[PDB]
Structure formats: C-alpha cells, structure tokens
Symmetry: C3
Subunit: 284 residues, 3 copies
C-alpha cells in the first residue's frame, strides 16, 4: 500500500552483506522454525543477527526475529533464514517478504521455503511431509499481497502469473530423493492455503478450507514465494504436517504450539537430511 | 497491527471503573442493539457513558457509541454494553474488542454476546433465535484479527485455539431453559459467519456464504468472542434472525435496517426474558 | 477506515468542473482500459487530465492515472474515465471510488462501467462479453469496502443493499441491442468476482473462484458500483473476457497483460459500437 523501502534500501542491504561475507550464495532456504538445527550441517558457516543487518525487519527484543547464516550445504552455496517474519506479528507483507527481495539482489536464484502446517487432508498424518504443488493466497484476495503498491520495474512485472509457482522439475527431482533414500511414509503432495493472524481455526473454518480444496494450512510462506517469482527465483517448497486440524465438534483436543514445536522437533533429522540431499539436484 | 493500547491503559480503565462502582461483576453481556430494553430488568443499576470512561472507544457524537450499565440480573452481578463498536464504523479490531479486555480485568469471567443477523439457512425464520455453535471469521482469514500484532502474555497465548469457543455446558444449559419455559418455535443452532463493512450482501454473496456452510450472517460479535477466549472468558452467545437473506434474483425485496430494527423491537421481551432466566445457570 | 475526503472536497471538485465545462452529463462511463478509443466517437469533446482536477487521485507520474472527457455519445451527455484507479496500485477504496462520488454531485444519474476480466466459466471464450448480473465482493468481506468508515448521510444510507445492483431494465434493454444488431457470439451473462492486488491467480485459486460460483474475475469495478448504488446511480456494467483463466496443472500457458491488452485492442470497435448504441436506451 505504501511499501516503505525504495530500491536503494534493498541494494544497500545487499552490498553491505555482500561485504561482510566471503560467500556468494545461489540458493536461499527459509525455515521452519523447527528445521532450526540445519545450521549445523552447513559448513564454513558465517552467522549474522537480523538486528545488525541494515534495514532488516527489526522485531521488539532482537530477536525473536533471529539470524541469517551463510555457508555450504551439500556443496551448494546457501544462505538461510533461521526464524522469519509473520503477518500476525503485526509486520506488513513488504516487511515479511523484505528478506526475499534482498536475497535476489544477492544473486541467489533458487529459493526453498519450508514451514509447519496443519493438515486438512484426512489422508495425511502427523509426521508426513507435503510438497507444495500450489497455494490459496487468501490474504491476497482481499488486498494483502506483498506486491500491492506501485511496482518497481527493476524487480519484475506489474502482473506476474503464479499458475506455475512451484518448479515442476524440482518437484519430481525430489520424489526421487524421497525413495532414492527409501522411506516408509510416502511424500505427500498438495495445496497450502494461507490464513493470517494468530488464532487457530474453528471447526467450521476447517470445513471451509477443505471445501476450497486445500490440503494444508499455515500463516506463512505464501507471501514470500509470491514475491520470489515476481523476480525470477525458482521456487520450491514444502510443509511439515504437524497436527490434524480438528475436523469435528466432539473431539476434545485443541491445536497448540506446543504439539507443533514438538512434532517439529520430532522431525528433526528427517528432513535436515532431506533438504541436505536435495541440494544436489539444484543446477549451478 | 499496532494496537494503540498498552497493558497499562487497560488496567487504568479497569481501576477507574472499579472505583466509581460498588459493583464487581462476574458476567458481561453485550447487546444487541435491540435488546436495548434489558437495562430495565437490571436492578441497582449504575450507568456510565462510554464518553466519560477513560480510553473507551470514542465515536464522533458521543454516542452513537452509548452506555455501560452495571447491576444485577436474576441475582447475578452483570455489566453490559448497551451499544457496541463495529469495524464498518471504521474502528480497528483492537478498538472494537477493547471493552472485552477491560471486562476481564474487571474479573468478569463469563461473556454472553448477542446480535442480530441475517438467516442463511432456509429452514430458519424471522423471529427464530440461533445459538452460536461455531463461527467463520472471514475478516480473520485475511489479517483482520483483534489478536494480530505483538501478543501480551498477561492476557493469553500467542496461538489460542477456537475449536472450542462456545461453551458446551452452557449451550445445552440453555436448550433446557428454552422449553423449560415452553416455546412454540424451537431454539435454533448453527454457525455465525462474519463479514465486515456496511453494505448488505449480494445474492451471489449469499450463495457463497451458504456454501461455506454458514447459517447466519452479521458484521459483529466474531471479533470480541475471539479475544474473550484469548484470556479465559467462558463464552456463550446467540443471534436473532431478523431477515431471510435474499437468496435469488427475482425477489423484489431488499434487506434493510428498517426491517432489522423492527424485528429486533418485535422480539423485545422474548428474549429479555430468555437471557434473564439464563443468568441462573451460570456457576459462581 | 478514515476516508480523507469531507463532503466539501467532493462538492468543491464538482463545482470546479461544473465551471470549466459547458456540459452537464447524465451518464458516466468508465473504461476499460482498452475501450480507450471510445473518446473518438464522442463529439463536442472537452478533455481534462486528472492531474489538474482538484482532489483527483493523483498517481506518481500524472498519469498513468489519465483523463476525464466530457461530450456527447449517441445524443447523450456523457463523461468518462479514460483510465481508472485500482487497489493494487496501493490506492485505498475511498480513493479508487472517489471519481464516483464526484459524478453524482455532477448530477449524472446513470453509471456504466466496463472492464477486462478473466473467464472462469468454461463455456465462455476469449472475445465474449459478459454482462454483469451480480458480484462477489471478496475484498469486501474482510473490511475493504469503499463504504467503510463513518457514513455521510447526504450521499446515502448506512446500510444499502446490493441484492439489486445491476439494473434489470437495462440488462435486457441490452440483450435487445445485441442481436438487434446481429452478432455471431451471444451476449454472456454472469457474476464478476473481485480479488485485489496485482498477481494473477493460481490454479487452485481458480478452482475456488469457480466453486464460489463466479463466472469472471477482475481486480476492479466492484468498488465503484457499490458506491454508485450507495447514492442512487442506476448501474449497468459488463466485461470483456480476455483470457481463459488457466484451470489445470499441465497447461504451459500463463495469464499476461500482454494477451490482455491485445484482446482488449482486438475488440476494439466491437464494443465501442455496442456502448455507443446502448446510449439510446438510457431514459432522460
Ligand atoms: O492447524 C494449524 N492451523 C494454522 N496454522 C498452523 C501451523 C503453523 N502456524 C504456526 C502456529 O500456529 C506454526 O508456526 C505453524 O508453522 C501449524 N499448524 C497449524
Ligand atoms: O442480512 C444481513 N446481512 C448482514 N448483516 C446483517 C445484520 C446485522 N448487521 C447490521 C445491519 O446490517 C445489523 O446491526 C445486524 O445486527 C442483520 N441482517 C443482516
Ligand atoms: O485472468 C485474470 N485474473 C484476474 N484479473 C484479470 C484481468 C483484469 N486485471 C488486470 C490485469 O490483471 C487487467 O487490467 C484486467 O482488466 C484480466 N484477466 C484477469
């Protein structure tokens, strides 16, 4: 609606980093949060706190909005967001997604994003992993689109498509890796719907999200993919099911964050490895 | 997104009231509007205008945003909002719902909210009363959640559930009272969807709200339940059907406010009594 | 939510115009954009740039937000917006729709609005034209309604209906004209859904818009009809299908603006004539 950043601010944040860093990454990864441990498997790791990076979304205690790590993961030059920004935190989307536009100026050209999510598809099960074939951008329908505002042509068009958001190549490239390391549960595949804003859904709210044809649901991610494609990045992403969204009045259970962080933690290596391998089927 | 109130402002509003008032309420009721007359049945009633209560949502002519009454209803200590704030008035939700957070600081621990609403369910009929089993929080999906912003931990969690918003006990406790005073029309039971913002729905808009599985529709309420549960309040609520939402091109009729205020007025005692009795099956 | 304009600003913009203009229009037309050429067929045309009209939505380079033309089209006094304001441009709705409230103060009393749109209905085909029977105002459900804010009673009610937005008379008045000039493709008729904000829909997003029962989809229009009826204007409008919204993973095609402007251009006279004739079945 405004967008408080000019092209310059982006550039200036880039160049700064691009000069406290030997590194020049090609892929950006975004967790998770409980893909946290990933940071380990990197090597030659250089860390930064968001709080010291020019223009980053500042949170209240920094943070709470955490760290940017640069390094090598499976002999690929990475950079990853260990902790991210959300709309429910009160951040507008050109903030949430800000990081995303710096990455591209860094010359990263693939983005992988991950996240936890509730499962809407009855078939799914806590533990599973759903690749993201497509999304419903509900905040988007109503005005909340990280693209809203005057478009800067240096980044992209006024009117990008999202029909093809989630790289095809990568997605198979990908189920390979899944059995090509032999797993009991299959890879899932489906649609992430976004809703904002922090309260968990009602039962009726679930029924509606199932009707729309959604398979999983977070409050995340959605935004920063949309603006990845606005400027080229190939995009590949996926989701940890983490709870079966309560689907009927009767059940006495209740989503909590709690169970989410746990499951996230339980799932852990799974995962860390998965991404880690996948690195290898990203081009050059 | 911000939230202009700090914890202090809430507290200060409480304590003020908590000291021009003998009273110490346990239940908060919210009308209606045309449950207005309720104020009568209270006894030992002490009134206040929003306009003199520190921090209240100020409207333009005060008001237009009206009065807070404290008293006893059926030998329960109450406090009630005679007139409320809406999003379509231009108020953000941490304003609409502000009152709600003061109540809890007052030590109220049950909230009952009522409202008029259009009927989406063909079965329903003008006059009926729909208990609220659940809700679709449509403004919510897109970012408009009274909880959005940085969470204050003194009130509640970052990530409350709403699966169980509408107290089970109370809801039966409740159909009892309905025949246990013998009424021709049955109690209805169903889902309130919220949309904002003041224009009435189109026909196509109705068809969609019916598809989502909604039974009734207002522009209200939704918010302040969500933030009631964010901090404990037991929540019980319901709705006066007030018009059958025009469901097909052809009909020459048109929702108006008008018919709504009327029906509201027609329905009157019905009602006033109902709540009045219900008081008695709230704990202590 | 605020609305930065007072009644005065509207009036002042009117009177200004109402006095660099001989003219006194009765109908307002809004394109399109690629109904641009229409301006030709007017006669006795007086032009203005938005940029010089007191209070108009200013864009960045003026503009980019273009010109207001007054004249006679088929022996009717018109005034038309050659280029309009959108929400995705970052404009709030009491800006987008501002023009609309001036028109009425000008004493215009019919409004016709046109627009391009993607087709959701499989039956439709690029080239077709869909009259607007009704709309889904999705931004609206969540708070984005040009009416939101404190209502000024001089313009309209607090709670207008939209059940009957799209004049019945006019709509047939209308299919007449269509064969009454003998066309191969039939007139289409259906519902325009609005979403905001500039990115094109995903596939999953389409499936949902089809489910809701929408036939076409733009990011436009919706707003300014709603506020037309808030103050009397008879409203009649329609849509150029312009692309078949990609309805399945597989297809390698992608909406672009591009194809849209083209089709718009291809369609051209079609059209220019159509409106041109239609003028004649507007009253006096
Ligand atoms: O059942 C759900 N509904 C909505 N969001 C989530 C989420 C995501 N939302 C956040 C907590 O609600 C958490 O960070 C997670 O990534 C997990 N489960 C659900
Ligand atoms: O048919 C409807 N659609 C949307 N809202 C309402 C309402 C509620 N909305 C307000 C007026 O629209 C009124 O205060 C009422 O509580 C009644 N009927 C309808
Ligand atoms: O497939 C679509 N989806 C959403 N909007 C449009 C539109 C409208 N949106 C604008 C460009 O997206 C264009 O001005 C047009 O009037 C055309 N096609 C589509």
């Amino acid at each position: 609606m405004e967008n408080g950043y000019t092209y310059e601010d982006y550039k200036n944040t880039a160049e700064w980093l691009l000069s406290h860093t030997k590194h020049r990454p090609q892929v950006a990864i975004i967790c998770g949060s409980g893909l946290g441990g990933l940071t380990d498997k990197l090597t030659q790791a250089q860390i930064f706190d968001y709080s010291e990076i020019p223009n980053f979304p500042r949170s209240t205690v920094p943070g709470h909005a955490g760290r940017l790590v640069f390094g090598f993961l499976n002999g690929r030059a990475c950079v990853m967001m260990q902790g991210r920004f959300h709309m429910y935190e009160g951040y507008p989307l050109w903030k949430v997604t800000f990081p995303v536009r710096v990455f591209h100026l860094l010359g990263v050209d693939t983005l992988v994003v991950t996240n936890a999510a509730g499962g809407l598809n009855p078939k799914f099960e806590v533990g599973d992993i759903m690749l993201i074939r497509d999304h419903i951008n509900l905040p988007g329908f109503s005005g909340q689109n990280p693209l809203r505002g005057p478009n800067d042509e240096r980044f992209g068009d006024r009117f990008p498509a999202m029909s093809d958001a989630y790289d095809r190549t990568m997605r198979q490239r990908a189920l390979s890796t899944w059995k090509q390391m032999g797993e009991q549960r299959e890879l899932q595949e489906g649609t992430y719907v976004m809703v904002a804003g922090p309260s968990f859904e009602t039962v009726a709210e679930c029924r509606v999200l199932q009707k729309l044809g959604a398979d999983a649901v977070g409050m995340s991610t959605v935004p920063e993919v949309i603006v990845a494609r606005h400027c080229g990045l190939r995009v590949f992403g996926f989701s940890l099911i983490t709870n079966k969204v309560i689907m009927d009045y009767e059940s006495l259970e209740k989503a909590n964050h709690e169970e989410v962080l746990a499951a996230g933690k339980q799932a852990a290596q799974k995962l860390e490895q998965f991404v880690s391998i996948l690195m290898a089927s990203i081009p050059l």
